[PDB]
Amino acid sequence: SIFFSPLKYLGAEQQRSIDASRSLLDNLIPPSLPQYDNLAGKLARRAVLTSKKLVYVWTENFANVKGVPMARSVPLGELPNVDWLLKTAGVIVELIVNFVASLPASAAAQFERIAAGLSGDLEAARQVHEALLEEAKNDPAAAGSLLLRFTELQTRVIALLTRVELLVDDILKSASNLVTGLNRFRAVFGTLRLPEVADSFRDDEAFAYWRVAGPNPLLIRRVDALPANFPLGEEQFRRVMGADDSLLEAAASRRLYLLDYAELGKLAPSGAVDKLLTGTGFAYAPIALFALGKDRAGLLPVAIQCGQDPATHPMFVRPAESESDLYWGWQMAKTVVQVAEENYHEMFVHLAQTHLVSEAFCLATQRTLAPSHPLHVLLAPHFEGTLFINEGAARILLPSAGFIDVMFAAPIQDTQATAGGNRLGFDFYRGMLPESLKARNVDDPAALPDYPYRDDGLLVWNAIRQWAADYVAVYYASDGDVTADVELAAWVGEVIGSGKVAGFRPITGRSQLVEVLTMVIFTASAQHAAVNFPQPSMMTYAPAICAMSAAPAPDSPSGKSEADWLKMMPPTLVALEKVNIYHLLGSVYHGRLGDYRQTGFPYAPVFSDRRVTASGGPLERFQARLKEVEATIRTRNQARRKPYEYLLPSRIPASTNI
Ligand SMILES: [Fe+2]
């Protein structure tokens, strides 16, 4: 049939190459608000938007993440580019090589040939990419006619990664049988350098410092009157803080800070959770009190209650050096808090509030803002690889016996339900950096001076905020241009109606639009960076932090031992999974905030509007201001106890893609 014949030749590779070239042409259109476009442009963009809703499709019944608004599938165009692919394949092949090299010869035979070939094929692909990038340079006028070999390279790396997958499954099918004090926790690294946290994780001031400069800087809050369920009294406080101090004066001088994990819900099973693959696991919803001394030199831990009900969880107080009989009970209570922390951090702060929020903004943007809408142009780079990585999360990390089931004590269907619930309850406006710092009363550096996430995050937040304002003003001259924009209004409708983004509301003016975009951009870029890139240095070593414990919380502050603490350490399989997935997820830096060039070949500018790209213009100013931020952070880091480098703009990707 004449009507069918084109289908034969029209494969996926051809279609990716077709979309890539279409991409670059549609790139030429000067962007416009729909009300300022001409009749022809209005008709074409309504047609494209209809076609966009074919390809970008909402579901709330995606595998393993029921309830969460997701893409039904990742469009061909949204598959990662060669550059991301090579990078990520590179890390996983390194980790495979490291692992096989750590096995006895007998057992290595399973994998050693497959691994050698994966490593050699990656090397052949990298060399291809290099030579392709050399011919473009030698003849840049012919550059556009090399894109097809870049798409061909893309097909080759995808196939590499499918083979990489088959090996990882075979290794991890066998790991429980392959795995062999804290000796086992160092052995899992193989040749990987152990993080610095492995040498100081027992230090009490280091433990407090997690609250302000660790992977979860969001939960800590000021407390003015302690709640009934945390019955710490003045004698206990004064025992830690000195007789010249008191709860009452500490409260009043804004020196008390509470860490309360009540919101974990089923992520903190009420008791033992026995699993075949990992044995008996526990996790917790503790409450910990921290305080500043009068000089506010630094936060100190004061007391830890290992669950919500004091009638069933005793109060653990910071011991003195001399108090050997309290030493181990206290190390157990800290471990409890860190078990809560991995759960809170990874499920809520990382997965629910970055990844899964950006999912919804991605889908709404592609479905309702035309490709030539200025806000599409602005936002699209900040979603690159987001749909792909999150489908990765759902499929690969969240099923039975997957990484999350292995690494987090809860039953996997409780984990999935609690993660998704936190996403659905997450309020877009309350979740804004300035709003979070106000609501928790941690916004004033004279009360809480050392808080690197706050002070470094405000630099980045405010830099993005000026950029958004500068950019909106190019296109929207008044509030009426905002309310007359039918695309922006449809986007709002979908963010609420399909995206289920709590707290989202009509946008009725420019200042509010700026705040909205600032949130969307910051969430995709800096917030993600801040909570994802700690994983390799802070969360790869299981005795410092793990989302499951093999023993219950300590039953008494007194009389515990080293043996009793060691009981809490997880099985070896958990530690093996931990080091590998956390190295991986924090080792791919793809794209950079403010660059706004394509991150794949031909690496073209994002913005063609000469008003945006003008010398001294909005984009240049944002790029200049990020470099000023870098320099200020680097200066701050000279005076800090440890550098906090996650919010250096040079380390912040534009998008959430790992
Ligand atoms: Fe991430």
Curated annotation (Swiss-Prot):
Write out the catalysed reaction. (9Z,12Z)-octadecadienoate + O2 = (9S)-hydroperoxy-(10E,12Z)-octadecadienoate; (9Z)-octadecenoate + O2 = (8E,10S)-10-hydroperoxy-octadeca-8-enoate; (9Z,12Z)-octadecadienoate + O2 = (8E,10S,12Z)-10-hydroperoxyoctadeca-8,12-dienoate; (9Z,12Z,15Z)-octadecatrienoate + O2 = (8E,10S,12Z,15Z)-10-hydroperoxyoctadeca-8,12,15-trienoate
User: What is a GO molecular function of this protein?
Assistant: linoleate 13S-lipoxygenase activity
Gene3D superfamilies membership: 3.10.450.60, Lipoxygenase-1, Domain 5
Q: Name one GO biological process term.
A: lipid oxidation
Write down how the cofactor binds this protein: Binds 1 Fe cation per subunit.
Does the entry annotate any disulfide bonds, and if so which pairs? Answer: none
What Gene Ontology terms describe where this protein resides (cellular component)?
periplasmic space
The subunit field of the Swiss-Prot or TrEMBL record says: Monomer.
What's the name of the protein? Linoleate 9/13-lipoxygenase
